[PDB]
């Protein structure tokens, strides 16, 4: 940039109240000066003032979702569960199923230097979360091929962000895309936003770098349009989309039961929950808030509401639908994004950010739920120990960490083997079962009668 191009950009920022981002220009080495110029040209400071103004200058009725919107792997008719599986697999076979992996988050409490998906939780195989999830895609495709005779494809749209993008692209590349075909793995970006003070002033990471953060998991909807991903899905003939977080080590990627369940209710949005078993669990819950599908924080649930027993089922809680951020969307729903993408608010996330101190402005993925007709919303309860194991904290926390994650995968593996007639001997811990061997506990008949000495790794 010329001196006059630079000064034009300094004026735009100063006029917007944000001129302090050039405060250290005098001491910058031209290359650094060039970087700040380009980074600052990607943001409109007026738009940032808008979002910051709405964010900083802005008793519900709670009922569970209606019986007609809900199901349970635990309680539903196994006949339904099996029909849903069979039908969901058919949609996979038809190449109608896509996955969006939400992998743009910075993960600032596990505090890895790498993207969370690269994390090695300590399994015998030493596989990353990325690889495990990819092998589930691979395995499910081969399962679908059995019934159809034809190749099945589930496109894997990996949503990253600025801080996550490049190292994720390099990791997938080094790992030869985990045995999937390149064309079927699509890495894309959500937008980022500068982090702001309590007074809405842009925060500086360095003298020549603005502190940025991804704009929330809710930024997914806009990012589908911007990245060109929704229209890629159009070309591919996608009709059904499964979306989850990279941190879930137990994720049933493109779960046919979930797809088959959602498709048969002809809903636009479905969700997975696990069971809340004790009233004191600090878990966000899916329910109707003011006659509308929503996710409500645990703090907003009074003692009496949390404690209430289900009248139709007195041994379990009335409000028990613990949110695991695991969603289905119809393609029809994705074509409606323009009509409401602007109706999603940026929330104030007070985090520790530079040169809790700051704010990250974030959209919430579930904020579209109350905008969605109750008749277009579904929810299925699943088994935690088969489906939900978040990597959220560093080792030594005792909760949602590498060890709980490893435990969850390795005790699943053992249990799967034991159900198939396998004899697991632990003179020592569990057994790691490769998704390339078993997606969901099937195809282990060959282990009947065999002694496996734990800890162990069953691989192709
Ligand atoms: O791909 C994603 C995923 C999540 N997020 C956003 O991250 C916010 C933080 O919550 P997360 O649940 O994503 O935890 P994290 O791994 O980011 O860990 P921390 O940074 O909180 O220490 C969530 O509210 C979501 O909106 C994204 O921006 N992009």
| 323 annotated binding-site participant | yes
Q: What angle do CA 159, 163, 166 make, to 5 degrees?
A: 70
Ligand 1 mutation pick, 117, 217, 365, max ligand atoms within 8 A of CB = 217
Give every CB contact of residue 389 below 8 A, 6+ residues apart in sequence.
248, 249, 250, 404, 405, 408, 409
Q: Are 66 and 242 in contact (CB under 8 A)?
A: no
**Distance of CA 272 from the midpoint of ligand 1 (Å):** 18
Task: Report which of 360, 55, 352, 46 is spatially closest to residue 192, judged by C-alpha positions.
Answer: 360
Please count the other Cβ atoms lying within 10 Å of the Cβ belonging to residue 391.
Answer: 24
Task: Report which of 241, 271, 219, 211 is spatially closest to residue 105, judged by C-alpha positions.
Answer: 219
Q: Are 372 and 221 in contact (CB under 8 A)?
A: no
Q: What angle do CA 47, 51, 53 make, to 5 degrees?
A: 110
Residues 97 and 129 in one domain: yes
Residues 453 and 435 in one domain: yes
Q: Angle between the 256-264 and 78-93 helix axes, to the nearest 10 degrees?
A: 100
Residues 351 and 207 in one domain: yes
Residue with tokens 């103004």: 53
Distances (CA, A) of 75 to 56, 67, 283, 436, 448: 44, 12, 21, 29, 29
Please count the other Cβ atoms lying within 10 Å of the Cβ belonging to residue 441.
Answer: 15
Residues 342 and 290 in one domain: yes
217: Cα within 13 Å, side-chain hemisphere? 20
**Which numbered atom of ligand 1 lies nearest the CA of 245?**
3
231: Cα within 13 Å, side-chain hemisphere? 6
Q: Are 293 and 331 in contact (CB under 8 A)?
A: no
In terms of C-beta density within 10 A (0-12 exposed, 13-18 middle, 19 or more buried), how is residue 124 classed? middle
| 396 annotated binding-site participant | no
Residues 315 and 453 in one domain: no
376: Cα within 13 Å, side-chain hemisphere? 12
Distance from C-alpha of 391 to C-alpha of 240, rounded to nearest angstrom: 27
**Which numbered atom of ligand 1 lies nearest the CA of 102?**
1
- The CATH number that applies at residue 24 is 3.90.550.10
The per-residue b/e assignment along 178-208, b for 16 or more CB within 10 angstroms, e otherwise, is bebeeebbbbbbbbbbbbbbeebbbbbeebb
Distance from C-alpha of 316 to C-alpha of 318, rounded to nearest angstrom: 7
Distance from C-alpha of 227 to C-alpha of 237, rounded to nearest angstrom: 18
Q: Are 449 and 421 in contact (CB under 8 A)?
A: yes
**Which numbered atom of ligand 1 lies nearest the CA of 160?**
1
Q: How far is CA 306 from the centre of its chain?
A: 26
| 415 annotated binding-site participant | no
The response to whether residue 108 sits with its C-beta less than 6 Å from ligand 1 reads yes
Q: Are 37 and 9 in contact (CB under 8 A)?
A: yes
Distance from C-alpha of 272 to C-alpha of 261, rounded to nearest angstrom: 11
Q: Angle between the 78-93 and 129-148 helix axes, to the nearest 10 degrees?
A: 90
Distance from C-alpha of 382 to C-alpha of 10, rounded to nearest angstrom: 54
Q: What tokens does 104 get? A: 């743009």
Q: Are 44 and 17 in contact (CB under 8 A)?
A: no
Cis peptide bond N-terminal to 136, omega within 30? no
Q: What is the 3-state secondary structure (H, E, C) of the chain?
A: CCHHHHHHHHHHHHHCCCHHHHCCHHHCCCHHHHHHHHHHHCCCHHHHHHHHHHHHCCCCCEECCCHHHEEECCCCCHHHHHHHHHHHHHHHHCCCEEEEEECCCCCCCCCCCCCHHHCECCCCCCCEHHHHHHHHHHHHHHHHHHHHCCCCCCCEEEEECHHHHHHHHHHHHHCHHHHCCHHHEEEEECCEEECECCCCCECEEECCEECEEECCHHHHHHHHHHCCHHHHHHHHCCCEEEEEECCECCCCCCCHHHHHHHHHCCCCEEEEEEECCCCCCCCCEEEEECCCEEEECHHHCCHHHHHCEECCEEEEECCCEEEEEEEEEEHHHHCCHHHCHHHCCCEEEEECCCCCCEEEEECCHHHHCCCCCHHHEEEEEECHHHHCCECCCCCCCCCCCHHHHHHHHHHHHHHHHHHCCCEEECCCCCEEECCCCCCCCCCCHHHCCCEEECCEEECC
Q: How many domains does the chain divide into?
A: 2
The response to whether residue 214 sits with its C-beta less than 6 Å from ligand 1 reads yes
Please count the other Cβ atoms lying within 10 Å of the Cβ belonging to residue 135.
Answer: 23
Task: Report which of 82, 133, 62 is spatially closest to residue 296, judged by C-alpha positions.
Answer: 62
Residue with tokens 């496109």: 155
Distance from C-alpha of 315 to C-alpha of 73, rounded to nearest angstrom: 17
| 109 annotated binding-site participant | yes
**Distance of CA 217 from the midpoint of ligand 1 (Å):** 7
**Distance of CA 351 from the midpoint of ligand 1 (Å):** 11
Distance from C-alpha of 123 to C-alpha of 453, rounded to nearest angstrom: 15
Q: What tokens does 72 get? A: 């349970």
Distance from C-alpha of 451 to C-alpha of 401, rounded to nearest angstrom: 30
Residues 416 and 438 in one domain: no
Task: Report which of 368, 375, 324 is spatially closest to residue 345, judged by C-alpha positions.
Answer: 368
Give every CB contact of residue 168 below 8 A, 6+ residues apart in sequence.
103, 115, 117, 118, 130, 158, 160, 187
Resolution value (Å, 1 decimal): 2.4
By residue range, what is the domain housing residue 100?
A: 1-421
| 102 annotated binding-site participant | yes
Residues 237 and 348 in one domain: yes
Residues 225 and 371 in one domain: yes
Q: What tokens does 200 get? A: 């809405």
**Distance of CA 350 from the midpoint of ligand 1 (Å):** 12
**Distance of CA 245 from the midpoint of ligand 1 (Å):** 9
Residues 340 and 458 in one domain: no
Residues 416 and 426 in one domain: no
Q: Are 133 and 84 in contact (CB under 8 A)?
A: no
Expressed in angstroms, the distance from the first to the final Cα of the chain is: 55
Q: What angle do CA 393, 397, 398 make, to 5 degrees?
A: 110
**Which numbered atom of ligand 1 lies nearest the CA of 360?**
8
Ligand 1 mutation pick, 105, 159, 214, 346, max ligand atoms within 8 A of CB = 105
The response to whether residue 104 sits with its C-beta less than 6 Å from ligand 1 reads yes
Distance from C-alpha of 415 to C-alpha of 432, rounded to nearest angstrom: 10
Q: Angle between the 31-41 and 3-15 helix axes, to the nearest 10 degrees?
A: 50
Task: Report which of 412, 392, 395, 414 is spatially closest to residue 403, judged by C-alpha positions.
Answer: 395
Residues 433 and 367 in one domain: no
In this structure, is the dihedral angle defined by the CA atoms of residues 263, 135, 117 and 237, taken in order, positive or negative?
Answer: negative
List beta partners, residue 321: 275
Please count the other Cβ atoms lying within 10 Å of the Cβ belonging to residue 392.
Answer: 17
Q: What tokens does 57 get? A: 């200058």
Residue 421's φ and ψ, nearest 5 degrees, are 95, 10
Distances (CA, A) of 202 to 161, 193, 211, 219: 19, 10, 8, 20
Residues 259 and 296 in one domain: yes
Q: What tokens does 6 get? A: 């630079």
Method of determination is X-ray
- Rounded (10°) CA dihedral 39, 42, 44, 45: -10
Distance from C-alpha of 52 to C-alpha of 347, rounded to nearest angstrom: 10
398: Cα within 13 Å, side-chain hemisphere? 0
Residue 349's φ and ψ, nearest 5 degrees, are -105, 105
Residue 395's φ and ψ, nearest 5 degrees, are -50, 145
């Amino acid at each position: 940039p010329s001196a006059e191009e630079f000064q034009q950009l300094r004026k735009k920022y100063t006029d917007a109240g944000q001129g302090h981002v050039f405060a250290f220009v005098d001491e910058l080495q031209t290359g650094e000066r060039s970087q700040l110029f380009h980074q600052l040209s990607s943001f409109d400071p007026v738009r940032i003032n808008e979002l910051a103004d709405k964010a900083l200058n802005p008793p519900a009725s709670l009922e569970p979702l209606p019986d007609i919107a809900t199901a349970s792997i635990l309680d539903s008719d196994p006949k339904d569960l099996e029909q849903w599986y069979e039908e969901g697999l058919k949609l996979v076979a038809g190449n109608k199923v896509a996955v969006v992996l939400m992998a743009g988050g910075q993960g600032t409490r596990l505090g890895s230097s790498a993207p969370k998906g690269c994390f090695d939780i300590g399994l015998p195989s030493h596989k990353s979360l990325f690889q495990i999830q990819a092998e589930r895609i691979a395995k499910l495709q081969l399962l679908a091929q059995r019934i159809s005779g034809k190749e099945a494809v589930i496109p894997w749209y990996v949503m990253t962000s600025g801080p996550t993008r490049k190292p994720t692209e390099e990791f997938f590349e080094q790992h030869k895309y985990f045995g999937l075909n390149k064309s079927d793995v699509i890495i894309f970006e959500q937008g980022v936003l500068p982090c702001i003070s309590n007074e809405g002033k842009i925060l500086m990471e360095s003298k020549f770098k603005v502190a940025v953060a991804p704009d929330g998991n809710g930024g997914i909807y806009q990012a589908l349009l911007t990245s060109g991903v929704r229209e890629d899905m159009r070309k591919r003939g996608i009709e059904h989309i499964h979306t989850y977080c990279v941190d879930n080590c137990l994720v049933k990627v493109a779960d046919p039961v979930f797809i088959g369940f959602a498709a048969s209710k002809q809903v636009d949005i479905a969700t997975k929950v696990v069971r809340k078993r004790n009233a004191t669990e600090s878990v966000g819950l899916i329910l109707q808030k003011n006659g509308k599908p929503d996710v409500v924080e645990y703090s907003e649930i009074d003692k009496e509401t949390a404690e209430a027993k289900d009248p139709k089922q007195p041994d379990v809680l009335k409000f028990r639908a613990a949110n695991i951020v695991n969603h289905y969307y119809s393609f029809k729903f994705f074509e409606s994004i323009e009509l409401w993408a602007h109706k999603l608010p940026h929330h104030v996330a007070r985090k520790k950010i530079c040169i809790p101190n700051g704010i990250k402005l974030e959209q919430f993925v579930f904020d579209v739920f109350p905008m969605t007709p109750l008749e277009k919303f579904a929810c299925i309860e699943v088994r935690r120990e088969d489906e939900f194991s978040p990597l959220k904290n560093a080792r030594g926390t005792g909760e949602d960490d590498p060890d709980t994650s490893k435990r969850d995968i390795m005790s699943q593996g053992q249990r799967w083997i034991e159900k198939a007639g396998g004899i697991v001997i632990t003179e020592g811990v569990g057994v790691e079962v490769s998704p390339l061997i078993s997606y969901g506990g099937e195809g282990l008949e060959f282990l009947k009668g065999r002694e496996i000495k734990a800890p162990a790794f069953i691989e192709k």
